Design a protein around this ligand. Structure first.
Ligand code: ATP
Lengths: 241, 235, 239, 39, 85, 237, 244
């Protein structure tokens, strides 16, 4: 049962889409990693940064994008596919706002992206672009929301999650943390995410080798934390641990 | 190794060759032999008709056909491709007459037929393989009598005397030996019929050949049984 | 691997799959056609059917117009499609030009249809052969034969299908102007040529007759019995 | 290089031996000889 | 040495040319630099074939001969096709 | 190989496409042609083939809009298609702008057109090498274009089978160019073609084709007797 | 392998072998470098004249896509020309659509869009060439970006693409680009090209430069003859000094 692997629309005798599985393997190929966590009234995403040179422009190099004025996303996997998916999400959000008159709910945007991915999986026209996309936002009613857009059209909502090479270990640590006092403050959730990254990579982060984005009920605008803010949080949490 | 470079008309082999086009050129051979000869007095076409069995009335094996009142086309290859290209030639000649109110030159009409045959796999025209047929257009125009040979690859070239079909290689040498620039139409007819008798399975007698002539004067003419017998008397 | 593609050439220069379509034609019940002075006749083998099967739904002879008939040998569904399209185009040509279709014109159209279906790669050739027998608008017993490869010729009498070779040889031997001098000798020749393949002679024979400016007539089984009796009497007398 | 192979050494080229008749092989070789028969 | 721990993966072609033409009557005017220029990756085996065919042109055609030899190593019989190429 | 050269859309595991190379090899399957230019003239000289002594020689130089001509080396089909495209483009340029089309822009358009098939599996690459000799306000231009959609601006170039000898001759004699009359220019080209030809044969009025363009001189083609003034004065080896 | 054919099939590892082969192909051509000085950007390329028959300026690998953007290519020159045409056409659309000059970051994003669209499908092959966009403007400073067959648009202070990219990057790293001016960064670029060029293998060689900066009024253009001559003279002198 080996020939059922070179096409996306061929079912294996056991009923498996080896091409979509390989797409997930490609998700676990960018090397980088990212984590998202939602607190009582805020959500925060933090992703490993890799700029192995003084020549690269860290300003342009990034993996966080504001899909709209109130929704942010972190990419992982192939960078070209990541940017393409980000632009598609931006277009979908703008189209939603134009058509219906109110900003796209995060779950809605995630669902539309999932539908596009499923269409690509079903119709043998394109390969399923291998990027995993995590959205964070503030819903006026349900509070913070965090979602995933894996390259198979599955879009379950989360309390906290991680994507990339070390997603399993990050998930284990995050479930350990969340099983006790799942309700966290802004500082508490930022600390949980940062310490999850630090322990799972077995290293501590300088302010430059890390990116953080935040959305809060008080300030429901996706904001990228600056070097000063991230360094302040790092030092404060390390001191007070 | 020649099994992956000839699955399509648009695949180049390591020698940089279109093997499918070459294959169609090979297919040209299966047809019966035809000989066209150009002379200052006109052009003569003679074809070995290949009646597979009597009871087939001869007016269905169209190896020589008429293009306008000033050209004749001799065919060797698939009857289907023959019919398609003959229809194209007739339509193009009539269109040119309609537009420019003149008679298309033999070179121009052969060029138009070749232009049709060019489209191999171009997704812009719908044939997908070479037309396995070789044509000889012998006609009369302002440049005097002329004869052109067109092959499936879309290539056309002037030929003061040429032979195509199954007996192509064997007849080309005979034409080369017997050809001197100045002849008469009767001399060309005699030489062509002699070559046909040389390279024909059957005994050359009345039927089993067709003979046509285009002269600076009377239009394209098909020699009937009477004239065929008259010439065969003293080929 | 020089096969299984309508648009691929072989070293000898063959289109093997249209050749295979012709071979598929060769696996059909025999159908003979002959032309007379003022009568054109088509005979066809029946092959008989199980008693539980109705007969009016099985057709090997079909009138394409008032002055043109078509005998068939090959795949039945392809036969139905080709005959339907041929009738459609006969009427369309009558519309376009106010003159009944000529046998040569209609057979050329059928040949063009088959050629169109065999040019491309996403189409299967019409695995059939047809005999078109008719009377031109000037009056002439024309008979043409069309093959799956889109090639059509004109004959005086030919047989297609299983017994094509043997029946063609018999017609070759016993076809003559005196043998077609009148409008009954042609029918006698047709039954004679079909008897080398059919068994009963009357229970496995269907004849269609076209007379100048007269509609097609399918001969009755009793008439076929009378004719075969006449041929048997002639044979025994000549013995 | 049967009647005048010394031309090769005259021109400074070494006349070699060993030719592969890969492919009327038998009678063509016999005519070329026109002898060492082998089984 | 194979074809599938410490593995090992113009000027050289010219040198090979002179080495294999050493036992010949090569004329000094020959531009082996030009010969190596007109190579297009032809390896040492092709250089050996070129020299061997130069010797064969000495045999037949008497002996430009180096250009013809390298072309015939390329095997440019060219079998002129009916279609232009 | 054997699984990376079955179509132009697949990369071999070496950073190379094999169908493009196959086309660039097919270009060398045709008869020799060469081109060059002076400070005031552009010229092409080519060896028109003869399929047989009876059949006349197939035409070689194609007459693009009067200020441009081309010499082809490759499939007749692709050569005709490209010639028709050139003629249509030049006619459109003359129709929209009341002045001739620049040769540089013409060759750029040809390069893009030949490049597009080299990416999508919908047709094979255009198997022809083109020597475009044109005259614009800037001056005479000789361009080469290959099936791989690469086009060069060449001062004196050769293409087709056995082009190395002509290229070497042009390399040696390039110093002469830019200060030669038209007769000397055609003599240079004819000598290059003689060198590329094998020794035992020669150039005859029957089998040689010449094309010239330049100042106040629309593209002119000489063949058969027309080339006699050049060959007659041409020196012998 | 089996999964390398076509660019629409993932290998079991999750790698698009067609795009990897495109990267390999681009890392086989002549080298190009660019540097973003504090108030401008400079491109240089080591063109390889494959034959002396070619005149000077043939195979121009430093195209200009819209007046303010220069584009230095490396790899398959056919794909390079096609991508240059696409970039010009996108810039023209942007200017028509928005009545103002196209930002280089946005232009690079659009061209990466195009390249990734090509690499996605299975009826087309990935672009077999990389390139670098550069521009300078009063309201945007100096920008430089590098695009590759996969279609990524990381920003850069400087970059090298082609055969010798790692050595060129190593040489570039030891420069004061953030503060140096155009008039000297051009000389440094020429020196770097002459250092990294391989004479014993590539034989022929030509040095092609360009820049866009304030001193050009934010308009890309080729180097003047005298400036290029002085830059290559400085590069030759530096090479001799290193050889000493
Ligand atoms: N060029 C030729 N001249 C003369 N006879 C020839 C020629 N080619 C073939 N023949 C005939 O072929 C036969 C000799 O061929 P031979 O016995 O060598 O077979 P072969 O083709 O080499 O086959 P194989 O090696 O496969 O057994 C004789 O009949 C000879 O007349």
């Amino acid at each position: 049962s080996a020939g059922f692997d070179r096409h996306i629309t061929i079912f294996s005798p056991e009923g498996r889409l080896y091409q979509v599985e390989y797409a997930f393997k490609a998700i676990n190929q960018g090397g980088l990693t990212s984590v998202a966590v939602r607190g009582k009234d805020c959500a925060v995403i933090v992703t490993q940064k890799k700029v192995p040179d003084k020549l690269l422009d860290s300003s342009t190099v990034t993996h966080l994008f504001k899909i709209t004025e109130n929704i942010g996303c972190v990419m992982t996997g192939m960078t070209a596919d990541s940017r393409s998916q980000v632009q598609r999400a931006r277009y979908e959000a703008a189209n939603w706002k134009y058509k219906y008159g109110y900003e796209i709910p995060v779950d809605m945007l995630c669902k539309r992206i999932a539908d596009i991915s499923q269409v690509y999986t079903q119709n043998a026209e394109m390969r399923p672009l291998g990027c995993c996309m995590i959205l964070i936002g503030i819903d006026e009613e349900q509070g913070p929301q965090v979602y995933k857009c894996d390259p198979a059209g599955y879009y379950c909502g989360f309390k906290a999650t991680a994507a990339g090479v070390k997603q399993t270990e990050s998930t284990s640590f995050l479930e350990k943390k969340v099983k006790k006092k799942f309700d966290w403050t802004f500082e508490q959730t930022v600390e949980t995410a940062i310490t999850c990254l630090s322990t799972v990579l077995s290293i501590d982060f300088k302010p430059s080798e890390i990116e953080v984005g935040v959305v809060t009920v008080e300030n429901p605008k996706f904001r990228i934390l600056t070097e000063a803010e991230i360094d302040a949080h790092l030092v404060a949490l390390a001191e007070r641990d | 190794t020649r099994s992956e470079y000839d699955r399509g008309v648009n695949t180049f082999s390591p020698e940089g060759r279109l093997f499918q086009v070459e294959y169609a050129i090979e297919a040209i051979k299966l047809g019966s032999t035809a000989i066209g000869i150009q002379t200052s007095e006109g052009v003569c076409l003679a074809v070995e008709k290949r009646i597979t069995s009597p009871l087939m009335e001869p007016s269905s094996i169209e190896k020589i056909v008429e293009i306008d009142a000033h050209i004749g086309c001799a065919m060797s290859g698939l009857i289907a491709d023959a019919k398609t290209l003959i229809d194209k030639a007739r339509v193009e000649t009539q269109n040119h007459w309609f537009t420019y109110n003149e008679t298309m030159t033999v070179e121009s009409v052969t060029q138009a037929v070749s232009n049709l045959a060019l489209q191999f796999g171009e997704e812009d025209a719908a044939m997908s393989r070479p037309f396995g047929v070789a044509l000889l257009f012998g006609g009369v125009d302002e440049k005097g009598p002329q004869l052109f040979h067109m092959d499936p690859s879309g290539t056309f070239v002037q030929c003061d005397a040429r032979a195509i079909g199954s007996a192509s290689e064997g007849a080309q040498s005979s034409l080369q030996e017997v050809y001197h620039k100045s002849m008469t139409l009767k001399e060309a007819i005699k030489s062509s019929l002699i070559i046909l008798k040389q390279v024909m399975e059957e005994k050359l007698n009345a039927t089993n050949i067709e003979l046509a002539t285009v002269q600076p004067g009377q239009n394209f003419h098909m020699f009937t049984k009477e004239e065929l017998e008259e010439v065969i008397k003293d080929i | 691997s020089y096969d299984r593609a309508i648009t691929v050439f072989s070293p000898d220069g063959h289109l093997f799959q249209v050749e295979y379509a012709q071979e598929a034609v060769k696996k059909g019940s025999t159908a003979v056609g002959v032309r007379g002075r003022d009568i054109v006749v088509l005979g066809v083998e029946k092959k008989s059917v199980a008693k539980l099967q109705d007969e009016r739904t099985v057709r090997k002879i079909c009138a394409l117009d008032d002055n043109v008939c078509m005998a068939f040998a090959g795949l039945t569904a392809d036969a139905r499609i080709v005959i339907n399209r041929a009738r459609v185009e006969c009427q369309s040509h009558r519309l376009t030009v106010e003159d009944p279709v000529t046998v040569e014109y209609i057979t050329r159209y059928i040949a063009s249809l088959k050629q169109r279906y065999t040019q491309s790669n996403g189409r299967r050739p019409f695995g059939i052969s047809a005999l078109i027998v008719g009377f031109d608008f000037d009056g002439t017993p024309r008979l043409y034969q069309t093959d799956p490869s889109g090639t059509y010729h004109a004959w005086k009498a030919n047989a297609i299908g299983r017994g094509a070779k043997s029946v063609r040889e018999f017609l070759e031997k016993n076809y003559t102007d005196e043998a077609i001098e009148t409008d009954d000798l042609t029918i006698k020749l047709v039954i004679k040529a079909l008897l080398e393949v059919v068994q009963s002679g009357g229970k496995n024979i269907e004849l269609a007759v076209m007379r100048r400016d007269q509609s097609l007539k399918i001969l009755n089984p009793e008439e076929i019995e009378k004719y075969v009796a006449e041929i048997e009497k002639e044979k025994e007398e000549n013995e | 290089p049967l009647l005048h192979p010394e031309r090769f050494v005259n021109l400074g080229i070494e006349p070699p031996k060993g030719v592969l008749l890969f492919g009327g092989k038998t009678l063509c070789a016999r005519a070329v000889a026109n002898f060492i028969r082998v089984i | 040495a194979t074809n599938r721990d410490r593995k090992i993966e113009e000027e050289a072609r010219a040198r090979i040319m002179q080495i294999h033409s050493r036992k010949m009557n090569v004329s000094p005017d020959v531009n082996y630099e030009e010969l190596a220029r007109c190579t297009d990756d032809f390896n040492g085996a092709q250089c050996k074939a070129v020299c061997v065919e130069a010797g064969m042109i000495a045999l037949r055609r008497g002996a430009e001969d180096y250009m013809e030899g390298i072309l015939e190593v390329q095997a440019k019989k060219k079998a002129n096709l009916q279609y232009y190429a | 190989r054997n699984q990376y050269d079955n179509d132009v859309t697949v990369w071999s595991p070496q950073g190379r496409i094999h169908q493009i190379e196959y086309a660039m090899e097919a270009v060398k399957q045709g008869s020799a042609t060469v081109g060059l230019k002076s400070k005031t003239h552009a010229v092409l000289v080519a060896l028109k083939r003869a399929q047989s002594e009876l059949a006349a020689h197939q035409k070689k130089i194609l007459h693009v809009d009067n200020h441009i001509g081309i010499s082809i080396a490759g499939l007749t089909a692709d050569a005709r298609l490209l010639c028709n495209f050139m003629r249509q483009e030049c006619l459109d340029s003359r129709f929209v702008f009341d002045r001739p089309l620049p040769v540089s822009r013409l060759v750029s358009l040809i390069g893009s057109k030949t490049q597009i098939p080299t990416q999508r599996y919908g047709r094979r690459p255009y198997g022809v090498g083109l020597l475009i000799a044109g005259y614009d306000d800037m001056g005479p231009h000789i361009f080469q274009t290959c099936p791989s959609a690469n086009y060069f601006d060449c001062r004196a170039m050769s293409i087709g089978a056995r082009s190395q000898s002509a290229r070497t001759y042009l390399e040696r004699h390039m110093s002469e160019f830019m200060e030669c009359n038209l007769n000397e220019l055609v003599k240079h080209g004819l000598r290059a073609l003689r060198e590329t030809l094998p020794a035992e044969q020669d150039l005859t009025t029957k089998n040689v084709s010449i094309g010239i363009v330049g100042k106040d001189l629309e593209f002119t083609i000489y063949d058969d007797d027309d080339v006699s003034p050049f060959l007659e004065g041409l020196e012998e080896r | 392998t089996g999964y390398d054919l076509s660019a629409s099939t993932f290998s079991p590892d999750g790698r698009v072998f067609q795009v990897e082969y495109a990267m390999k192909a681009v890392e086989n051509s002549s080298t190009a470098i660019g540097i973003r000085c504090k108030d401008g950007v400079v491109f240089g390329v080591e063109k390889l004249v494959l034959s002396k028959l070619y005149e000077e300026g043939s195979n121009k690998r430093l195209f200009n896509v819209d007046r303010h953007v220069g584009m230095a290519v490396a790899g398959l020159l056919a794909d390079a020309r096609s991508l240059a045409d696409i970039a010009r056409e996108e810039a023209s659309n942007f200017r028509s659509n928005f009545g103002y000059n196209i930002p280089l970051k946005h232009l690079a994003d659009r061209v990466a869009m195009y390249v990734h669209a090509y690499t996605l499908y299975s009826a087309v092959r990935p672009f077999g060439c990389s390139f670098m966009l550069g521009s300078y403007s009063v309201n945007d400073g100096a920008q430089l970006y590098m695009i590759d067959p996969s279609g990524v648009s990381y920003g850069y202070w400087g970059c090298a693409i082609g055969k010798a990219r790692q050595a060129a990057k190593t040489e570039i790293e030891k420069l004061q680009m953030k503060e140096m001016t155009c008039r000297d960064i051009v000389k440094e670029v020429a020196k770097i090209i002459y250092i990294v060029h391989d004479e014993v293998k590539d034989k022929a060689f030509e040095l092609e430069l360009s820049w866009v900066g304030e001193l050009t009024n934010g308009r890309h253009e080729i180097v003047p003859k005298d400036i290029r001559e002085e830059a290559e003279k400085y590069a030759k002198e530096s090479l001799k000094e290193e050889d000493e």
